[PDB]
Amino acid sequence: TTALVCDNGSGLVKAGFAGDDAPRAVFPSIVGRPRDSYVGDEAQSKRGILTLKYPIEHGIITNWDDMEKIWHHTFYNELRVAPEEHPTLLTEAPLNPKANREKMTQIMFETFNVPAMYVAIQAVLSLYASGRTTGIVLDSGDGVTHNVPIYEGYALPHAIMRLDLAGRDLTDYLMKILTERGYSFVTTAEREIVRDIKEKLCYVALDFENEMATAASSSSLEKSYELPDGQVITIGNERFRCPETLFQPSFIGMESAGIHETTYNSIMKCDIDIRKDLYANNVMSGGTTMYPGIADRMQKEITALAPSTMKIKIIAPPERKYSVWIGGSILASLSTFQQMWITKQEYDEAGPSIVHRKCF
C-alpha cells in the first residue's frame, strides 16, 4: 500500500504520495459556491458566479464545510484515488486547537473512510526534510509565520512564536503601494497579478537603509513588469520595501516583533543547554521564505541579537516551498513510522480523542 500526504495551507494545498520527491498536486485552497461547488483553479476561473472562500485562516481550519470539499477534491479530482485504500498523513499548524485535531480525525475516518491517519506539525516535517531532528524552524506561508524549536524530533510548544503576517499580507502591501502610485490593484483577480510581481521581483535587503539610499541615487535597482493590459510598471525600492515588513511589521501597522526577533525570543524560551544547537540549525520553510537575500539578512540579524561567539547557521533549502510536504513524504515512508498511524480499528474503539494520545 502507498500512503498519501496532504499538506493543507492557508493559500495552497500540497498533496501527493509518500516516497515521491514533490507533491503531485498543488492548487489554491479556495472553495467557490454559487447562487454546488468548485475548488482551486476552476473556482478562480468562475469567480464571477461564485463566492470564493479560504477554509484555512492563518493556518487554522475555520470553515469545516469548505474544508471537507477541499479534501474531497484532493482525493477524487486531483490525486484520483480511493481514500479507503490509503493511510493518509495530514498536517496542522503549530498550536492547533485540540478540537480541530479531533474534527480532522473524525472527518477522515467517518467521511472518507481512510484505513489509517496521522496529523503532524508542519514545521516539524520541514525540519525532517532537512535531515534534522533538532533545530528551530521559521515557517512562513500565505497566512501565518511561526518559529518552532524542536528537540529530538518533537516541537517544544511553550517556546513556539507566531506572527499573523505572511505572504498574503505582503501581497496586499505591494498592492497598496502600487495603487498609491496610480496602478489600481484592489480585486481578488488583481491580487493574483500583484502576487506574481512580488514573487518575481521582490527581495530582502541586507541593509535596508543602504538599499533605500542606493535606490534614491541610481536606477540600478529598477525592474519592469508588463501587466495583462500592456502597461509596464517599473519598481525599485518597492522590491525590498515589501518583504522588509517581515523584519518591520510596523510597515503595515502591526506592533509585533519582526521575524528575527521572534526567532531569538523563541530560542530564549528554550532550555539554556540546547540553545547552541538551535542557533546552528535555523531552518527556513515555506513560500514566504523564498525571497532572495532572506537567509543572509537573517544571519546578520540573529548575529546581532545572539552572544558574540555563538555559531549561527541559516539553512534555506532550494525546495523549501514544499519542505513541509517533503518531510511528510519521508516520514510516512519510514518503517519506524508504521506503528504510529492511528488505525480505523483504533478509531472505532476510541473515537476522535485518540488523536491526542497517538499524535504527540
Ligand X SMILES: Nc1ncnc2c1ncn2[C@@H]1O[C@H](COP(=O)(O)OP(=O)(O)OP(=O)(O)O)[C@@H](O)[C@H]1O
Ligand Y SMILES: CO[C@@H](C[C@@H]1OC(=O)C[C@@H](O)C[C@H](O)CC(=O)[C@H](C)[C@H](OC)c2coc(n2)-c2coc(n2)-c2coc(n2)/C=C/CC[C@H]1C)[C@@H](C)CCC(=O)[C@H](C)[C@@H](C/C=C/N(C)CO)OC
Ligand Z SMILES: OC[C@H]1O[C@@](CO)(O[C@H]2O[C@H](CO)[C@@H](O)[C@H](O)[C@H]2O)[C@@H](O)[C@@H]1O
Chain residues that interact with ligand Y, rule: CB under 6 A: 19, 21, 120-121, 124, 128-133, 153-154, 319, 326, 329-331, 333-334, 336-337, 360
CA distance 267 to 261: 10
Which is nearer to ligand Z, 292 or 307 (by Cβ)?
292
Min CB(73)–ligand Y separation in Å: 24
Q: From ligand Y, ligand X, ligand Z, none, which one binds at residue 130 (CB under 5 to 8 Å depending on kind)?
A: ligand Y
Q: From ligand Y, Ca ion, ligand X, none, which one binds at residue 32 (CB under 5 to 8 Å depending on kind)?
A: none
Residues in contact with ligand X by CB under 6 A are: 9-12, 59, 141-144, 166-168, 195, 198-199, 286-288, 290-291, 321
Which is nearer to ligand Z, 293 or 317 (by Cβ)?
293
Among 293, 295, 310, 333, binds ligand Z (CB under 6 A): 293
Min CB(124)–ligand Y separation in Å: 4
Q: From Ca ion, ligand Z, ligand X, none, which one binds at residue 195 (CB under 5 to 8 Å depending on kind)?
A: ligand X
Q: Is 114 within 8 Å of 83 (Cβ atoms)?
A: yes
Q: From ligand X, Ca ion, ligand Y, none, which one binds at residue 132 (CB under 5 to 8 Å depending on kind)?
A: ligand Y
Min CB(357)–ligand X separation in Å: 26
Residue nearest to ligand Z (CB): 293
Among 141, 167, 236, 352, binds Ca ion (CB under 5 A): 141
Q: Using the rule CB under 6 A, is 203 a contact of ligand Z?
A: yes
Which is nearer to ligand X, 55 or 341 (by Cβ)?
55
Tally of CA atoms within 13 A in the half-sphere of 231 that contains its CB: 11
CA distance 276 to 309: 10
CA distance 19 to 108: 21
Q: Which three cell numbers stand for residue 225?
A: 513588469
CA distance 196 to 185: 13
- The identity of residue 199, as a single letter, is E
Applying the rule CB under 6 A, the residues between 217 and 236 that interact with ligand Z are: 221
Which is nearer to ligand Y, 21 or 229 (by Cβ)?
21
- The identity of residue 35, as a single letter, is R
Please, which residues have CB within 8 angstroms of residue 127's CB and are 6 or more apart in sequence?
133, 135, 137, 148, 150, 283, 327
CA distance 254 to 256: 6
| Other Cβ atoms within 10 Å of 157 Cβ, number | 12
Min CB(171)–ligand Z separation in Å: 17
Q: Going along 45-160, which residue ranges are E strands?
A: 51-53, 56-57, 60-61, 88-92, 116-121, 135-140, 145-151, 154-155
Min CB(302)–ligand Z separation in Å: 17
Q: Using the rule CB under 6 A, is 292 a contact of ligand Z?
A: yes
CA distance 315 to 331: 20
Min CB(352)–ligand Z separation in Å: 46
Nearest in space to 183 (alpha carbons), one of 195, 170, 192, 174: 174
CA distance 258 to 138: 12
Min CB(141)–ligand X separation in Å: 2
Min CB(286)–Ca ion separation in Å: 6
Q: Which three cell numbers stand for residue 281?
A: 540549525
Applying CB under 5 A, the residues found at the interface with Ca ion are: 9, 141
Residues that bind ligand Z (CB under 6 A): 203, 206, 211, 221, 292-293
